[PDB]
């Protein structure tokens, strides 16, 4: 019985070692955040428009000016290989088959180059900055291998306090490795190559990355640039002012700050203030959750755990199935609310509860 | 112990095969909708008017200008024969004995003509449009056999995602059949009678039925016409503008869109805007639920599952009992709030919580 | 461990036959009302006034111009004899020992005259009108035996639908009797004494008692007259306009209309509009509940089930204990919020939640 | 697994006799207060400021003009010796090692002089007034032994009704004693020394202590004076007007009045009205709770049960661990919301829910 995302979560929990399942499902501290991420969707209900011809529906939509099959993306998640062999590739291929982008994590198990060589879909690269020089290296690598979009994640200045991991003494799977940091020269002495080597032997990332640093990154990357991890219209607006082509409102799936607001709380305001693409993630599980965000102005929704449940439970085919169910779910929802064209969604279909 | 609707639900669950009970009780996806349909009634409480002579009470009321025993109706529900033998007839006869209308579903187990021949009560016909020509045939049949009112259901452009049915692989009971589609010619070739035959061998209904199509139906039917499945004052108003004599606010008992608002949320507004009869259903189980809707301006309330529990548990007699309990419940409620005449109900007896 | 009202409820449930306990504790239909009666008190929290000398506190207060030990009363409850032998007397004597009034129910087990003869405390009489002539007889009897106050209960035009009683086929205890209806002549023929005899062989009360009837009662009774069962400032105000000396806001302990508002919802408004004594009951269990009502303007609070738990569990001594605990509870509360004199309570000590 | 305060509570419950655990964890009456103290923190969520350099963070802050390691203090709690041998000293030494103040209770197990002799940290003295003369004696003793700050607790005019203690017949541990009342002369006759001896053989404190009495105390103590137990901006303001250098908003950890508001409800208003230091306690368990209070204007947060769990579970080392976890928790939180300097916190980082 695999009829929705929750069904895949259940199957994933039965197939994954507890330690890995907890790494995946876990949230920060009391996990009031992940619960809030789900509960906030109940703050809106639908007011369908009847007697509208919905015999011909379209989920096609432009994301950052580029057309794709539906307003969805498989977001960046680390250590996918711990969930399923060659997890990064399975996700990328399923996204490509579905006609949507796949975002590779800086902490992926498959390197930037290897994926680009084995997948011709729309590949995006999510960047974490531990060392400036090293970050510049990955950015150029992504540029040279055909990655269309760069995503800077800004909500991991310090590691989230995930107590499930602490209880399990969670250690990065042995058979896995942070491939993108491979080959990064060693044996060299002096300032960097010592200053740098120190930074990469640390589990902490660059907590000094500020607005000025964003300008630096903006000049380095020539294509579309998005800033991920924002939770205020003000920050979203500043990002646009600094050169970003759009933003991704997100609280990292409730894994960083348990009491952070849900990005849904500032979605409408961010859309109204920035006037630029506002993407979003965190808590999306049902097609209705997605449609509510799109109706509030979201350009697209990125999936985190939803597609990972498919991956963990049934590999690549599992991801295909979750995307198929979600697409049919979105389609069914559009028909029921009387909005045949997904690009016609507006707050007029919602009722604040 | 059969003292209320819930008691009949309990007895129905014990007598019906799980698969059938789930078909009856089930809702869309997470079933947050059916729960909301019940919970929303708690948003209003009563403020009784004391020292009012309620020794003589009346539940009599005009629905669409025609007087009936009480502001209730047994709404249209498909496959009643799966709940109890000749279920459609049992319901119709119980409604007639109670002095209220019965609405026959397009997907009933007893044909339009057979029921009209065996029941002389006020019979209404609920229409689903799968094929225009076929729909026209049923409409004329209902007209020629004495059906007083036509009800167009507009909230099933596509089938609701009811996961209980998916889990049970629910298949339309063998001993049952969609009688109203019987005799519908076959063996014929060319456009329709091939184009048509295709549409009826499909579980999908006409998702293109729009406002223009409603005008078509309006000219075809000479008597009272109601549009069912509306969830906004705006749609209700447009229906009246297009010729409808009234509307039925409804979310199909939470069986189509899990996150749809409860029709109770737009009842007062629809009454104020349309100035025409506004009937309603979805979630009604207690007499207090019904009185609250009537106090907000509802012309009448249609029962869905409430009377079906009586049917499934004890057949025709079961329906009679549920209607008797509900009538006494409404009567008792009117006495307690100090409104002896049901037609005198107003928002003045309610307190928003 | 008998440290509060709940402890006595627990002990009462262990000592009483289930049928009797259910008669006592039960509410109308779903019992959402009794729950609401309790929950509504959480809508207010205390904002204590510190550094106030509370070394000398006083709970003494005038109720209808007459001074009593504390702003409490044991309200009218029927069939007290079913809870404990000579229950009416036990309650009356405990109230008298505590320095507060006791209200005798029309449906008591001890007659109006017998109680007045065995108790010299402040006795009030609660009237139910089944037959006008008979009611007049009890009213005069109460007047001639020294009852100081008359209370007309108006919220039982028809019997509440208490399903626990229906499930238990609850029958008025055999060893008990509605003593106040004793001796009421029989064997006589013609109009009344036939018309009357019919009314008393009925479980229904006079549902026609209206404002005009209240004027009738007002001229019959020369002392303080209160109307009980009101749930709106408007009705309270009309009662005063018709001659009442005060009112008792109440929903009959959630035993008549499950969805009725809690009287706490219209307490402040009734106090402001009538400018006359506004007493109240329904849901009071803790001293804090009582203080909140008094702070909102209530003249006094009548206890229903609270003191009955003491009665059922430990007879007269049980009632004394509950009143002692409640008095100490109120006293302790006054000290903690910084209001040494109970008559100085105001909304200034409360915070709306 | 000791990763947060709750983990220490769990370990403390396993090591402490039930009677003692209940004395510690218990609240007044229904304990709705302690629950509210926790729940109220969910009324605010965080809105992080991204791309802020948080590589260098500081928790250092001035409390009453004096710099300390972080905006925390170990508040005054009685009978610490019942939780762990020499509990008062263990707490004081852990606070000193952490760089924060420790407040000694009037009802401590270690005397004012003994502690000051064995601990050179910042020691504060919390005063309870049972007898004026005796209180004056302790105040001068605290002054002569080096206590920097005096804290008057005003919310125990009468003892809270803690039913857990009543159920357990809780008796002050035998091996323990209210040391600060030791030596207090006896054998003397006449007025005081008889009037006084009577007051100290009583479990009740001076319920007459008012504003005038505060003026008396203000002239007696030359250093910083704080009034603890306030629950309104008005009282806080009056305290400042009467000479206090600051206040401590508090409901005594929900141990005195079950329905008292949480001090968090009047924090912002008290800060705005008084313009003086507003400290606070009651319900703090997570670093996020603390940061929310600081963001609303609180000068510092006092810990009650949080550090006592560390004490009860693992003595002095346990307190050190809880303070270490809380410091790292606060630090981590500051980094995640983008406020590197704790003194820069403002309501701008919060979202009202
Ligand atoms: C197992 C796991 C690993 C993650 N790794 C990363 C990462 O490497 N880079 C990043 O930008 N976000 C990362 N995220 C956050 C996701 O991009 C996304 O914001 C989040 O999962 C959205 O919420 P949801 O899980 O409810 O869909 C991770 C989330 C999970 C559940
Ligand atoms: C078993 C079942 C079958 C239904 N079949 C139909 C149908 O054939 N036509 C229609 O207009 N509505 C149909 N409905 C919806 C009802 O008319 C009605 O809107 C709904 O049951 C009201 O909610 P309630 O069940 O809470 O009373 C059906 C509902 C149930 C429970
Ligand atoms: C067992 C029982 C019998 C009652 N009988 C009467 C009655 O004879 N007359 C009347 O005026 N109210 C009657 N009441 C209502 C009470 O006067 C009072 O309004 C109610 O109990 C208040 O609520 P509480 O039970 O939460 O305190 C009765 C209530 C109970 C619980
Ligand atoms: C076991 C225990 C004993 C206490 N003793 C005292 C005391 O002697 N003096 C005082 O001012 N407050 C006293 N308090 C109240 C604390 O100072 C503080 O207000 C309260 O614990 C804060 O709430 P929290 O426990 O949720 O942190 C006590 C609290 C507890 C839990």
Short mmCIF file of C-alpha atoms and ligand atoms in Angstrom, two decimals, chain B residues 23-25 37 75-78 83 105-107 126 128 151 153 155 228 250-255 281-285 302-306 308, ligand 2:
data_model
loop_
_atom_site.label_atom_id
_atom_site.label_comp_id
_atom_site.label_asym_id
_atom_site.label_seq_id
_atom_site.Cartn_x
_atom_site.Cartn_y
_atom_site.Cartn_z
CA UNK B 23 -16.70 3.22 1.39
CA UNK B 24 -19.41 4.90 3.47
CA UNK B 25 -17.44 6.50 6.31
CA UNK B 37 -16.77 19.27 9.11
CA UNK B 75 -29.47 13.91 0.21
CA UNK B 76 -28.23 12.06 -2.89
CA UNK B 77 -25.88 9.17 -2.18
CA UNK B 78 -24.66 6.52 -4.61
CA UNK B 83 -25.71 -0.68 2.37
CA UNK B 105 -28.44 9.86 -7.12
CA UNK B 106 -27.47 9.45 -10.77
CA UNK B 107 -25.47 6.46 -9.50
CA UNK B 126 -29.36 14.62 -8.53
CA UNK B 128 -23.92 13.89 -12.68
CA UNK B 151 -29.90 19.02 -8.48
CA UNK B 153 -23.61 18.19 -8.47
CA UNK B 155 -17.80 18.91 -7.14
CA UNK B 228 -24.77 21.48 -5.36
CA UNK B 250 -21.29 21.43 0.32
CA UNK B 251 -17.86 19.80 0.30
CA UNK B 252 -19.35 16.39 -0.48
CA UNK B 253 -19.05 15.15 3.10
CA UNK B 254 -15.28 15.62 3.01
CA UNK B 255 -14.96 12.97 0.30
CA UNK B 281 -24.87 19.62 3.98
CA UNK B 282 -21.58 18.09 5.20
CA UNK B 283 -20.91 17.17 8.81
CA UNK B 284 -24.45 17.31 10.20
CA UNK B 285 -25.02 14.71 12.94
CA UNK B 302 -29.49 17.66 3.61
CA UNK B 303 -28.48 14.49 5.41
CA UNK B 304 -25.82 12.25 3.96
CA UNK B 305 -24.22 9.69 6.26
CA UNK B 306 -26.62 10.28 9.18
CA UNK B 308 -27.28 6.03 5.82
C1 LIG E 2 -21.53 6.81 0.54
C2 LIG E 2 -21.71 8.19 -0.02
C3 LIG E 2 -22.10 8.35 -1.43
C4 LIG E 2 -22.36 9.64 -2.05
N1 LIG E 2 -22.85 9.72 -3.36
C5 LIG E 2 -23.22 10.91 -3.91
C6 LIG E 2 -23.90 10.99 -5.24
O1 LIG E 2 -24.12 9.97 -5.90
N2 LIG E 2 -24.31 12.30 -5.66
C7 LIG E 2 -24.10 13.55 -4.91
O2 LIG E 2 -24.48 14.58 -5.34
N3 LIG E 2 -23.46 13.45 -3.68
C8 LIG E 2 -23.07 12.26 -3.19
N4 LIG E 2 -22.54 12.17 -1.87
C9 LIG E 2 -22.44 13.42 -1.07
C10 LIG E 2 -23.73 13.69 -0.29
O3 LIG E 2 -24.74 14.16 -1.10
C11 LIG E 2 -23.56 14.71 0.82
O4 LIG E 2 -22.96 15.92 0.24
C12 LIG E 2 -22.60 14.36 1.95
O5 LIG E 2 -22.73 13.03 2.43
C13 LIG E 2 -22.89 15.29 3.10
O6 LIG E 2 -22.08 15.01 4.28
P1 LIG E 2 -22.32 14.08 5.48
O7 LIG E 2 -22.08 12.69 4.96
O8 LIG E 2 -21.40 14.47 6.61
O9 LIG E 2 -23.76 14.33 5.81
C14 LIG E 2 -22.19 10.90 -1.20
C15 LIG E 2 -21.76 10.72 0.21
C16 LIG E 2 -21.53 9.46 0.84
C17 LIG E 2 -21.17 9.45 2.30
#
